[PDB]
Amino acid sequence: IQTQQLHAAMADTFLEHMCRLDIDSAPITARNTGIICTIGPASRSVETLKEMIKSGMNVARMNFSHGTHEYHAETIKNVRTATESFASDPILYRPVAVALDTKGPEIRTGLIKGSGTAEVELKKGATLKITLDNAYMEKCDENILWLDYKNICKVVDVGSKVYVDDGLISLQVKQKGPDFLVTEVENGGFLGSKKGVNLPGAAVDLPAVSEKDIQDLKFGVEQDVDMVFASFIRKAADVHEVRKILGEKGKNIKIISKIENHEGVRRFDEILEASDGIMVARGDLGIEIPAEKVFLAQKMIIGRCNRAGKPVICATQMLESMIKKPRPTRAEGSDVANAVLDGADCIMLSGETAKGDYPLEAVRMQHLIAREAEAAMFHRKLFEELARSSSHSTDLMEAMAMGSVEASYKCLAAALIVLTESGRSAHQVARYRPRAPIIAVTRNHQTARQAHLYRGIFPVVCKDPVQEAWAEDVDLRVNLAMNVGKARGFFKKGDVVIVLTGWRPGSGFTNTMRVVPVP
Amino acid sequence: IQTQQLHAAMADTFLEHMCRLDIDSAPITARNTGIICTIGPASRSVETLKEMIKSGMNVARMNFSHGTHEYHAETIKNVRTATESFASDPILYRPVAVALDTKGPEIRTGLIKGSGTAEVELKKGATLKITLDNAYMEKCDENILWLDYKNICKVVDVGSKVYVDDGLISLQVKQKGPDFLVTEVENGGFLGSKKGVNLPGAAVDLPAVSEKDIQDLKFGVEQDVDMVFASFIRKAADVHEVRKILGEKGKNIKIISKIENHEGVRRFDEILEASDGIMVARGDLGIEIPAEKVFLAQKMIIGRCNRAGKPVICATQMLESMIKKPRPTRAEGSDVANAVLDGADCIMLSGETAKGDYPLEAVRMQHLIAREAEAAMFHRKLFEELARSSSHSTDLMEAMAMGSVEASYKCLAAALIVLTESGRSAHQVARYRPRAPIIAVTRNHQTARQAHLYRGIFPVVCKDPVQEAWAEDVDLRVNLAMNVGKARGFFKKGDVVIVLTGWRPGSGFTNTMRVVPVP
Amino acid sequence: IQTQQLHAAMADTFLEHMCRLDIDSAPITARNTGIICTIGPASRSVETLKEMIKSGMNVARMNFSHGTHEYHAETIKNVRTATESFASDPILYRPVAVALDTKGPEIRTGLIKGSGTAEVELKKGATLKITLDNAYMEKCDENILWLDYKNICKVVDVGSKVYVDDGLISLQVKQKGPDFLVTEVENGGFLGSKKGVNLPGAAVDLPAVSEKDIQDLKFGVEQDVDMVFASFIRKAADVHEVRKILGEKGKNIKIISKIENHEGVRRFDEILEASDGIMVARGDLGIEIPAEKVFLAQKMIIGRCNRAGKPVICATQMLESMIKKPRPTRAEGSDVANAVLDGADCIMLSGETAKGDYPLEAVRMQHLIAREAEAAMFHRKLFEELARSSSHSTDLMEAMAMGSVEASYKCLAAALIVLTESGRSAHQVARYRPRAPIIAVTRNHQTARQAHLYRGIFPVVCKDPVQEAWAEDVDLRVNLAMNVGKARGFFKKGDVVIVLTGWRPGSGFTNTMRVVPVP
Ligand SMILES: C[C@H](OP(=O)(O)O)C(=O)O
Ligand SMILES: C[C@H](OP(=O)(O)O)C(=O)O
Ligand SMILES: C[C@H](OP(=O)(O)O)C(=O)O
Ligand SMILES: [K+]
Ligand SMILES: [K+]
Ligand SMILES: [K+]
Ligand SMILES: [Mg+2]
Ligand SMILES: [Mg+2]
Ligand SMILES: [Mg+2]
């Protein structure tokens, strides 16, 4: 029986491709979908980290919706420690990135009847009034509700909706005043103190960045974070703002715009153009838009990204049941397989590794489903479809990407080796979806850390100094990749590999391509 | 902004098709995807049943792995009661089908401490002895465990694994005896009473059809069940026996073989050949085979069925979060939408409706998503694909089917209207996957109940009597469809529908198509 | 308006592509299709010949159906003269090929009324007892007939047709004898003396090669011909015999099997495999088979050759008008251009250049058309189709030929440069149908000559001695192609080009690929 789901790879049609999927067809050793683990209490310890680093973790995410700089600084400190506990061997040394997950702008309610531990009960078809009179700031009750969003009137209109405490409570504006609104509880419940407000369908004035956001980004630039996951991105203008805050010191830091509402969606094109990657925040998204429409947003966002060659991340509730159990639901395993299939660059674990009882087991599972799904894609058709979208482009590095990938399918290469410092060269390739692993060999650490954002890229860091001669230095870097691949089980000695490099030092892109056999 | 993803519909490529999905493209009222519910404690009532018939229920499934014959019989009458409570308006009456889900070759444990209630905390690395000594049948405690599988000893070998309670509890065979097995608790949790045992990687010599099965089978016959779900089918053979046991009185009962294990998958082909339909048994399948490979099975089978034009049901853990929470995950919404997109004729809810606290909420959800996804399919390419797959057949009914579908895509018909008694003429169309709802008008209740099994068919029963003149009889059922369609919200006065009928009485199939406008 | 028919090349569909052809979309300087000219009286002069090379000729063909060796050897000498007349300038030198075209085995009649100039009248419904009696050998009268085809009885059954005078007289064999054939004249004419016969649909016994053919071959061998167009090939065994003859001395001689009949067509695949290439001899073909059907074979013959990677030549009457007019008919323009579209590697001129009044006017026309049709092809589609059909191949060289071809479309390279001594590495790329010219740089003459046989290949001979240092010898050779391209007007300074070279001497194939700019 044929491995790596090859026989399906020859289907002339999509139905036939499906029809040939065989569970007896072994996947390969290598996994291309990156895994982004949320770090916290259950995964914060160093030792835990080493293991998680061992299970398949590639990116440590830091959620700044909480914790103090001191906390994070510590978390961050362990990662690095764990991470580096392996550099002793440049071969078995796997880099790990670091993400700053911005808390961002919010809308909150006042104090209920003065207490912070109080509740009011809101019933269906009830008249609840919302005001901006600073007085009620601590006197919110069931007839009067006070907000912390000055412009709430300008942005909403008659008949719009408000969602208190995260979707739970909903209200329809049945009267529009200048500093108050008159809502009708529609789908009510229990209301508490300082709960989140959502205005689906609206065009929120709210600044790109919160005051807290700022000390958080600064703190990231200081901590040398590889990237930033930016909240509630609504337009391109918003992206420029974080871009500004990062300043010149963190111009290298990647900005991953997070899609959280109607706007982000309806203006996705302008956001993609300005972002460095994109995030499908299924979670917050699911609150702002109807849950049945989430899958729409997720596929469109992914296609669009795939099509444009910008990494896209699928997040939240992937393996949820697993925070408390050792095994995921059938829907969970299917959520994961499909994400990849949709073409996600990388998938993520929130609660699962942050709070959960089975963080390792959660990593391993994602590691597992991904490989299986990665082999069940339809390379031949995706590739064409992809190429046709980029026909308008005659870039040279693209041309080398395309030709390199085609060759990789033709002769069944075991891998694709790429020497690069920026990473663009490898990014270009990944963008084309080889089926085999793209082993990128860089001397720039950061470059190796941010490479994970791409599908297929397995970054290898070269610690050796620059040789006198390009040929030799080029041949050294290559051997490195070959040793690493041989040890990690990606390939044997008779395998065929595709190699991309620069003809001469300082060439511009890998403009050279050879078919070389594993020594 | 367009409706029904008609914009994504014109895409030339899949990727482009995805790139254009739009959260603002409103779906149609109609839901082609069968929704099958598992009746039990939470939804057994009548008032609840009616409520669930209004919400979306099409098929009630009686899980025969439990309860006494007199319990089901009751559940069954309530189903019928509810169903018929709306038979006043031939128009506003929706048929509901009935299924008998078999027990087959299941393995169960004994009583934990004679109580059916009592749980017991299994611990990691502990020792647990499995015996076959019936003294233990009710003394199942944390140190001794009893199974109902006599030859378990002769099929299992050392090192092997044993999975209790939906693969949650994992035990390793550390020692083999003649009546017992020494196992080590490789993965612990709380061991309840009368729980499911899976022996992955073992040859269970249990017969497909067992004595109890037979009663059950015969019982269903008695009850006038529309179809049966044969549990644990592994070979074409197993599917015959059920047929036999079912004999002449139950010839029209439709048999849905359930793919629940490795062998079942392997001999999928022969099994499919002998089956009226098929169900993807996620739960058991996910334990029998690796969790990671399940989604490969789900696609192959659906592909394969779809190709063959045989109903396929996707089942298990689709909406689990909802047994206890009013809201499904983000991963759940996926599953479902993805099952619809994969090409499954019906989706199912087991516990979400049997014990769950939000049984009615579960259905509306599956319904909500189903319409959305439905419009998110890529008709054109699917149509093309389906056609090529069935190239060797020159059948006039297929031929008739293909044209009507093709004509509906083109004029954007609101609905296809079919007149059949056997079901065939409508089954052949649903197989071509029109976008629009297939209103099938029968005079045969059963043909109408089992229609539910098909994607797009919205059965409608003609109570009126056979008019003497053909023309009038035809014109008669067409008006019923019209009214019904008109009454449901599918079409309006200026709408355009496509009508499939017999030229003359005894035509054999629908051999006359007509593009007619809604009156 | 875009050049090279590039708007049309972006069409997603064939209908769109056709719809997008622009009379104002200028072709390129370079012609891809080889032009085969048949040398005779009208162009046997060194002067005319020099003008022909300038004009476009790539291969000179010598029809051995005629002349003596004396003649030919001389015609040959003149071609070699003219060719070398340009050798002064290595950048202007253009290799020319010499092909030997075999008379091939035939069927003749006897004398008519003893007198060689005697012409009898055949009429319809008559009776013609053809005999093998040497008696009649010189007195073939309107009643009796004599043939050289001894086994004609063995080979012809009842009802079978027999053609006399290049199909002018059709005779039906109404009663077979042991050595006579009683035929009733179906379509009668003027039976002349010494006419060639044709046995449509017959399994001719005749020898692969005639006694003459043998002399001719050994001669061809002594004259250093480059390829032999073998006539009347019906099975693989025939090709096999021809090789036997050429022997060891003429091993590097390519053999182009000419498909002149029902059988050869029928057993097409066995011949293709045994041959180095194929020729669609429409002349003979449309005699042996019905004209209405010729196009079918040409399309099939060619579709099949392209699939496999074997040069294919389309012949006879493409521009016959031009024998006596300086301008071809609207119908000949289509023929030439369609053949080009069908995918012919080479195009051919016979009496148009061998006896016509407008020889040069004819080549010129072939060249104008080919450049234009060549732009009109749908490379993206073609490329995909070709790749699919080779899918069962995991050849290192094809892979390389494939990535290259693809990169070429991607960045719109102005050419592909290939360094080769066998010519294989070039053949491979050519098979894949790039849009830009394939400049092949060899140091081997036969290679360079033989290469014209292939589409896209534009052979350049490297006269400069081998360098000691690999890189230098390569770069030298690369420069040459560069200079030449710039000179012939293929590309400028800005232009990109793809270079295929061997990593190391004795690499076996061009395993190195690069995107380089014209200096
Ligand atoms: C990840 C994304 O943002 P978060 O809510 O975690 O801040 C989400 O909503 O899931
Ligand atoms: C539905 C199928 O059978 P069950 O386990 O529900 O009896 C399964 O295994 O999920
Ligand atoms: C051209 C080809 O061969 P020829 O007749 O030139 O020998 C033909 O049969 O027409
Ligand atoms: K956050
Ligand atoms: K069951
Ligand atoms: K000849
Ligand atoms: Mg948020
Ligand atoms: Mg089961
Ligand atoms: Mg001939």
User: Does ligand 3 come within 6 angstroms of the Cβ of C258?
Assistant: yes
Q: How far apart are CA B127 and CA A284, in angstroms?
A: 45
Contacts of A139 (CB under 8 A, 6+ apart): A110, A111, A113, A114, A146
User: Does ligand 2 come within 6 angstroms of the Cβ of B282?
Assistant: yes
Query: Can you tell me which residue has the tokens 């200081």?
Result: A222
Domain B31-104+208-373 has CATH 3.40.50.920: no
E-strand ranges in B39-160 read 59-63, 97-101, 120-121, 127-131, 144-146
Phi, psi of A408, deg, nearest 5: -70, -30
What spacing in Å lies between the alpha carbon of C339 and ligand 9's midpoint? 22
Q: How far apart are CA B53 and CA B92, in angstroms?
A: 11
Distance of CA A138 to the CA centre of its chain: 39
DSSP class of C395: -
In C, minimum Cα distance to A502 occurs at C514
What spacing in Å lies between the alpha carbon of C247 and ligand 8's midpoint? 73
In A, minimum Cα distance to C391 occurs at A410
Where in chain A do CATH 2.40.33.10 domains reside?
105-207
Q: How far apart are CA A384 and CA A389, in angstroms?
A: 9
Write C322-329 long-range contacts (CB < 8 A, 24+).
Answer: C322/C352, C322/C356, C322/C358, C322/C361, C322/C362, C322/C365, C323/C351, C323/C352, C323/C355, C323/C356, C323/C357, C323/C358, C324/C356, C324/C357, C324/C358, C325/C358, C326/C358, C326/C361, C327/C361, C328/C362, C328/C365
CATH superfamily ID and name for C1-30+374-519: Pyruvate kinase, C-terminal domain (3.40.1380.20)
Helix, strand and coil percent figures for chain B, each rounded to 5: 40, 20, 40
Structure tokens at B409: 């895509």
Binding residue per annotation — A219? no
A120: contact with B, CB 8 A cutoff: no
B13, B336, B371 ranked by CB distance to A385: nearest:
B13
Distance of CA A209 to the CA centre of its chain: 20
Q: How far apart are CA A478 and CA A440, in angstroms?
A: 10
Subunit contact B376:A296, Cβ cutoff 8 A: yes
Q: How far apart are CA A68 and CA A64, in angstroms?
A: 8
Torsion C417-C423-C428-C430 (CA) sign? positive
Residue type, position C338, single letter: N
What spacing in Å lies between the alpha carbon of B64 and ligand 5's midpoint? 5
Query: Can you tell me which residue has the tokens 């250049």?
Result: C353
A400: contact with C, CB 8 A cutoff: yes
What spacing in Å lies between the alpha carbon of C258 and ligand 3's midpoint? 8
B265, B292, B336 ranked by CB distance to A372: nearest:
B292
Contacts of C400 in chain A (CB under 8 A): 407, 515
Check if the beta carbon of residue B336 is closer than 8 Å to that of residue A332.
no
First to last CA, chain A: 27
C469: contact with A, CB 8 A cutoff: no
Look at residues A434, A373, A379, A377 and name the one whose alpha carbon lies nearest to residue A403.
A434
What 3-state DSSP class applies to C338?
helix
B 306-365 near A (Cβ less than 8 A): 306-307, 316-321, 327-338, 342, 365
Binding residue per annotation — A490? no
Phi, psi of C453, deg, nearest 5: -55, -25
- Annotated active-site residue C131? The verdict is no
What 3-state DSSP class applies to C227?
strand
Structural biology method used: X-ray
Q: How far apart are CA A76 and CA A101, in angstroms?
A: 13
Binding residue per annotation — C325? no
C158: contact with A, CB 8 A cutoff: no
Q: How far apart are CA C217 and CA A283, in angstroms?
A: 81
DSSP class of A196: B
Query: Can you tell me which residue has the tokens 């200079």?
Result: C483
Where in chain C do CATH 3.20.20.60 domains reside?
31-104+208-373
Q: What is the dihedral of CA A287, A289, A293, A296, to 10 degrees?
A: -100
E-strand ranges in C78-160 read 97-101, 128-131, 144-146
What 3-state DSSP class applies to B422?
coil
Strand (E) or helix (H) holding A514: strand A512-517
Contacts of B466 (CB under 8 A, 6+ apart): B443, B473
Q: How far apart are CA B234 and CA B244, in angstroms?
A: 17
Task: Give the pairing of strands A169-176 and B190-191.
Answer: unpaired
The per-residue DSSP string of B185-240 comes to EEE--EE-SS-BEE-TT------SS-HHHHHHHHHHHHHT-SEEE-TT--SHHHHH
Structure tokens at C271: 């011949």
What spacing in Å lies between the alpha carbon of A259 and ligand 1's midpoint? 10
- Which of A284, A305, A334 to mutate to test binding with chain B, by most B CBs within 10 Å of its CB? A334
Check if the beta carbon of residue A460 is closer than 8 Å to that of residue A481.
yes
Q: Across the strands, what pairs with A198?
A: A163
Task: Give the pairing of strands A161-164 and A169-176.
Answer: antiparallel
Distance of CA B391 to the CA centre of its chain: 28
Binding residue per annotation — A507? yes
B286: contact with A, CB 8 A cutoff: yes
Check if the beta carbon of residue B278 is closer than 8 Å to that of residue B256.
yes
Look at residues C41, C71, C37 and name the one whose alpha carbon lies nearest to residue C54.
C37
Q: How far apart are CA C187 and CA C191, in angstroms?
A: 12
Structure tokens at B414: 């609101």
Contacts of B446 (CB under 8 A, 6+ apart): B226, B252
DSSP class of A202: -
Torsion B15-B20-B24-B26 (CA) sign? negative
Look at residues B459, B474, B393, B402 and name the one whose alpha carbon lies nearest to residue B431.
B402
Structure tokens at B35: 């929704």
Active-site annotation of B, residues: 61, 108, 258, 316
Subunit contact A15:B303, Cβ cutoff 8 A: yes
DSSP class of C215: H
How many residues make up chain A in this entry? Answer: 519
Look at residues A124, A152, A126, A128 and name the one whose alpha carbon lies nearest to residue A141.
A128
What spacing in Å lies between the alpha carbon of C213 and ligand 9's midpoint? 13
Q: How far apart are CA A96 and CA A458, in angstroms?
A: 11
In A, minimum Cα distance to B304 occurs at A19
Q: Is C104 left (phi over 0), alpha (psi -120 to 50) or beta?
A: left
In B, minimum Cα distance to A338 occurs at B338
Residue positions forming the annotated binding site of B for ATP: 63-66, 108, 195
Subunit contact B372:A283, Cβ cutoff 8 A: no
- Residue C506 sits at the vertex; the CA angle it makes with C501 and C396, to the nearest 5 degrees, is 60
Q: Whose atoms come closest to the Cα of C196: which ligand?
A: 9
Contacts of B84 (CB under 8 A, 6+ apart): none
E-strand ranges in C69-164 read 97-101, 128-131, 144-146, 161-164
C392: contact with A, CB 8 A cutoff: no
A11: contact with C, CB 8 A cutoff: no
Q: How far apart are CA A225 and CA A242, in angstroms?
A: 14
First to last CA, chain B: 27
Look at residues C452, C490, C461 and name the one whose alpha carbon lies nearest to residue C84.
C461
First to last CA, chain C: 28
Task: Give the pairing of strands B346-349 and B34-38.
Answer: parallel
How far, in Å, are A3, B385, B433, B511, C6 from residue B299 at the CA level?
Answer: 18, 15, 17, 34, 40
Resolution reading in Å: 2.7
Q: How far apart are CA A422 and CA A29, in angstroms?
A: 27
E-strand ranges in C302-404 read 312-314, 346-349
Q: Across the strands, what pairs with B131?
A: B146, B180
C402, C407, C496 ranked by CB distance to A410: nearest:
C402
Q: Whose atoms come closest to the Cα of B100: which ligand?
A: 5
Structure tokens at C350: 């016979």
Contacts of C512 (CB under 8 A, 6+ apart): A512, A513, A514, C499, C500, C501, C502, C503
Buried b (16+ CB within 10 A) or exposed e, C25-57: bebbebbbbbbbbbbbebbbbeebbbbbbebbb
Contacts of B5 (CB under 8 A, 6+ apart): B20, B21, B22, B25, B375, B376
Q: How far apart are CA A162 and CA A177, in angstroms?
A: 15
What 3-state DSSP class applies to B252?
coil
Work out which ligand 1 atom sits closest to the CA atom of A65.
7
Contacts of C393 in chain A (CB under 8 A): 410
Domain B105-207 has CATH 3.30.565.10: no
Check if the beta carbon of residue C343 is closer than 8 Å to that of residue C370.
no
Where in chain C do CATH 3.40.1380.20 domains reside?
1-30+374-519
- Annotated active-site residue A316? The verdict is yes
3-state secondary structure B343-408: CCCEEEECHHHHCCCCHHHHHHHHHHHHHHHHHCCCHHHHHHHHHHHCCCCCCHHHHHHHHHHHHH
CB atoms within 10 A of CB B226: 26
CB atoms within 10 A of CB C159: 9
Q: Rounded to a whole number, what is the distance in Å from the CA of B161 to chain A's nearest CA?
A: 16
Subunit contact B330:A16, Cβ cutoff 8 A: no
Q: How far apart are CA C214 and CA C208, in angstroms?
A: 10
Q: How far apart are CA A180 and CA A150, in angstroms?
A: 10
User: Does ligand 2 come within 6 angstroms of the Cβ of B195?
Assistant: no
Work out which ligand 3 atom sits closest to the CA atom of C283.
10
DSSP class of A327: S
Structure tokens at B160: 């092997």
Binding residue per annotation — C421? yes
What spacing in Å lies between the alpha carbon of A52 and ligand 7's midpoint? 27
Q: How far apart are CA A460 and CA A94, in angstroms?
A: 7
How far, in Å, are A34, B475, C297, C373 from residue C334 at the CA level?
Answer: 56, 57, 17, 10
Check if the beta carbon of residue B60 is closer than 8 Å to that of residue B98.
yes
Q: Catalytic pick from C50, C258, C431, C449? A: C258
Q: Rounded to a whole number, what is the distance in Å from the CA of C129 to chain A's nearest CA?
A: 58
C388, C496, C514 ranked by CB distance to A503: nearest:
C514
Subunit contact A334:B187, Cβ cutoff 8 A: no
Residue type, position A396, single letter: L
Q: How far apart are CA C429 and CA C309, in angstroms?
A: 10
Q: How far apart are CA C173 and CA B466, in angstroms?
A: 68
Q: How far apart are CA A503 and CA B479, in angstroms?
A: 76
Work out which ligand 3 atom sits closest to the CA atom of C102.
7
- Residue B239 sits at the vertex; the CA angle it makes with B233 and B243, to the nearest 5 degrees, is 140
DSSP class of A109: B
Ligand 1 is surrounded, with C-beta below 6 A, by: A 65, 281, 283-284, 315-316, 350
- Annotated active-site residue A108? The verdict is yes
Choosing from C231, C233, C313 the residue with most ligand 3 atoms within 8 A of its CB, the one to mutate for a pocket test is C231
Contacts of A342 (CB under 8 A, 6+ apart): A298, A299, A302, A303, A314, B18
Contacts of C167 (CB under 8 A, 6+ apart): C198, C287
Q: How far apart are CA A372 and CA A392, in angstroms?
A: 33
